[PDB]
Amino acid sequence: KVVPIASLTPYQSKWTICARVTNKSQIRTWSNSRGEGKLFSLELVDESGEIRATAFNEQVDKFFPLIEVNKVYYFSKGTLKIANKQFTAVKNDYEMTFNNETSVMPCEDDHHLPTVQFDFTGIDDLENKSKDSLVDIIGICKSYEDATKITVRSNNREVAKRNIYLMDTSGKVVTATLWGEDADKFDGSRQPVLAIKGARVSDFGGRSLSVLSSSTIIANPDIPEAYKLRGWFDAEGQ
Template structure:
């Protein structure tokens, strides 16, 4: 028969956890607080902590462990794992709004700012979304804030309270102030308020939401980004094209818009102007569905980027479409078009006229006959005719006063080895160089062998430099 002793009485709740108090401290079981702790006994408390003896809650500051090899540290001046000193960290009770019993003697910061001379004056709560801009008009004790929630709020700088709210009806992209003016960048509009006289203006446009603004020299500059689907509202270049056949009836110096396929382009060349200065020139030929072609002369900067791109496309076998905006008509050797400072050239524009012209050229215009309206003394148009060398001799072409325009296809059999250039005189006559022929005297200097008339005097000289000039035959 088994005999058992009397079962010891179960300790009370206070006695059971009283023994664990010293071992677990004041830590309450988080699972017990959620009602799902399965341990019995549990090494953590299953009771609520009693309230503190005083009404204020002491700061829960981290315990600073003593450094190895030395005595305990008081925590002042020592950095924690986050690399900050205690005086650089925020007091957790101050942040949560609970008064700290240490007050000004707390080793943790009771301020949002770390710099000297800065302190939090007020916390402005009121916007539902992010702040897009803050404006502080000069001579006013009001602060303006704009938010993505479509509201512009006015705050009293003395009390920190919102004194007025303006519903602008759209998210605010930016907000600035200049003198008594406050500008709010919205979608497709900029609102302007004058805080002195109460004037309100709306600057309407169609370019999307304004993200930045700046005022300089009494002018307001705004930067915006078009939203999806709004790029169609941006104005595009407008053309008023005229067929090449109609250019024959236009007067000289008229301004015209023309579009055509580039069927020929010449390399850029340097020519001497009447005033003695040099300039770049490039010539190309345009043809369109009217069966006519016209010569376009590109001057100065038009020969560089745009002209080189056209040259590259033509050399690779492509025939690009060129739209000319504001070209000037000339009547030198027939009707031609030249570029001026306001001319705009667009290569392969994304417009219906260019697509239709390209389809016509690929279908029939590439090999079809073309009548040129350029390089003619009279207004009668001409057709380029291909001739052989024997026909040129038999028909005595080029011997009359009127030039004969022909096309020749031949093979180069021999190139004459004469000089293609000569050494030019470096003397400056006014604003241009003389460029007369000089010769080397064999002593490291150059002799001028041409006579230069300056003030009716024949001048020769010896120089140590020259400039090569190209001979064109």
């Protein structure tokens, strides 16, 4: 029986949520001073709230191919505990981890559950944010560059890299780096309003941003401050 995400608490292992996926990761392996394994993570949203959920190893195999982004599912039992704020933009005290107990059945998208949500920081306000801290931002993609292939000696990877320059009603332009696939797909033609959840702050250049693979980019967010942006921009931004 279905409770909101707002209600979920480590003190009660009996719960079902009807949540829609807003972010699914790809499967990633790790190995360290502690452990070995693979995982993928999700970000969920309902009418009450949002939550990050992560499946490991044997659930990654169960569940990776049964969950896709933008769809609505019942999630039933997982592991809850304090969110590591360091590593998310997601707005919850806790954080779910699948287990052998987890069930994931498809739920009806008839209650229209919402889409990504954001807690924005003005591009003029990033001066007051810390390096490595995660931000949410909305901006006109004033301009963008072609993608290039960076070469990472530290770990031996050749990554796609695409810089984009984002401006908001303050006239402050911030450089933002896309990586990998993102760097490759992105087309900012007609200068769209982008809303990016969980972009990571960087100090290169004073303040810039790095769009991580955990970040969630919405091309023309159907949200009030996007019309507010295009409005200004087609006037003062010109």
